[PDB]
Symmetry: C3
Subunit: 221 residues, 3 copies
């Protein structure tokens, strides 16, 4: 079942990527960069999850699905880039703020991998550092990055706020599931965690970009 779920995931990622490609051909004032980011996220995630489907992207240690970290270390910084460029749409870019989010995010995913390879107090030190990185990402998202969105007018700021809440709601689920599941306290069963880390990312990767791109395209007319 776990294999088939991962094949299904990879197929949905492929369909999302093709959809973003088709949108890219009639862009409606959205720059090519935002379509490229929207395509890379699902294609990379699809490849990583394909490796799990084939029985390759995991080892016994508990089962570490290390292919999830290979996925997230690329897909999650690109999602924050997508979010930052939404805030900056129609105005001057702040690439310093964007790379701040990328750095916090890459650190966050690495702490998750290290936490998974750790035992006891050490595991929760790494987990805690990752949670602190996420909190700072959310502070940037609803603080300075939202103020950039407000500077780009009512309609953009409304769209940004919707996508920021969408992303934030989904992202806080990941460390929650991780702590509850086999990598953490072991309250939730492996199969439950597998379904959560199939369904969440479908919304985090394809859903997010459908909402993000549709809202930006609508600003054209």
């Amino acid at each position: 079942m776990i294999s088939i779920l991962h094949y299904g995931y990879s197929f949905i990622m492929l369909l999302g990527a093709l959809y973003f490609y088709l949108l890219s051909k009639d862009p409606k004032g959205v720059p090519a960069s935002e379509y490229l980011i929207a395509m890379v996220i699902p294609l990379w995630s699809g490849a990583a999850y394909l490796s799990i489907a084939l029985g390759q992207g995991l080892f016994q240690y508990t089962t570490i699905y290390y292919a999830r970290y290979i996925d997230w270390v690329i897909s999650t910084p690109l999602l924050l880039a997508a979010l930052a460029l939404t805030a900056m749409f129609g105005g001057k870019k702040n690439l310093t703020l964007l790379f701040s989010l990328v750095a916090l995010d890459v650190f966050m995913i690495i702490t998750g991998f290290v936490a998974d390879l750790s035992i006891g107090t050490t595991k929760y030190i790494w987990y805690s550092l990752g949670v602190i990185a996420l909190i700072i990402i959310l502070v940037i998202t609803f603080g300075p990055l939202r103020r950039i969105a407000l500077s780009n007018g009512t309609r953009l700021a409304r769209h940004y706020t919707r996508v920021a809440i969408y992303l934030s709601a989904l992202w806080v689920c990941y460390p929650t599931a991780w702590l509850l599941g086999p990598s953490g306290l072991g309250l939730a069963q492996e199969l439950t965690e597998v379904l959560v880390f199939i369904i969440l990312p479908i919304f985090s990767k394809v859903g997010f970009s459908i909402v993000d791109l549709h809202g930006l395209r609508k600003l054209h007319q």
Copy 2:
């Protein structure tokens, strides 16, 4: 023999690098970025192949020359950057298209490495995904990237087209040799593959940049 061939390769990479450095000192209207890229490619490849020469960049699994993938994951994106900047010479840059090629290319090399670590059907799934990435790179090369080159005038577009054909002809040999050799069907012997992955990259890395830089330098007024 395999060790000595890799020492030879690394020496040729060093000579290429020094040649590009000397050209960089009298640049003839070619930006410093294109000289930097031309130098990094052979120096990085030379270091990776030095590790094989020293008996370090390989393990038994059949022999996986993993240092080739360490080489290509850096050298091949830089070659496509060189190709993209050639198309954009004298005009506005399209870094979105450039990073599209980089992303496709890094994926391509990773699928190769995973294919090498895989057995049976799994191996050919990864190989096929890599080949699909290469096809998209070639579609971009002869489609949108070539239209950028045409927008920069007859002489630039003529040079771009020659370099694009040069690169494309060499690059399709890599997945061909891979499939024929020990990582794939195992029709070609290890030593045969070693010579192919010595001679191809000499043309792919030093040859390519000699041709690319010479054509760009020739566009120079005064």
Copy 3:
């Protein structure tokens, strides 16, 4: 003792990061990019050294202990330090990102050769070490040659500050391959504990000290 020294280091990195964050809030004409670089360096190093303190960022190999977390640190922190140095030289003028990325490429290569040298035995070890030393020499040639000429093109006051920071960095950086060669990774003349203290104290000056001096000099160029 080794564990406690690493906890201490990580705490000092955290304090440096906080100081640079506070400076960033009253920037005095220094772009946000230079404050971000100044913060990432110590935070990343602090994380890497935290892993050593927890007993994780090290393994036994050739009977010696390889502190592999040091290379994970340096491969990110050292290119960012040269970026900080290059942006100092370019302060008030046109950026040369080609020269900046030249330093980044040399530097990443340098750290990788160090790691490979540490995993190597005999002549092979010293081939890798030598390639890293050649990379450092070229970095220092760029630092005092073309990069210094960019700094001089940005006027007396900037060039004076650049030269001070270039000497500061260069003096500290030549110590790393010197300690490496003397210590357990090289000739084994210096003891593990001695090397540990050197690779605690040097980086405190290389990462926090450097950026205090660098940022203070740039901030002082500001009028208000």
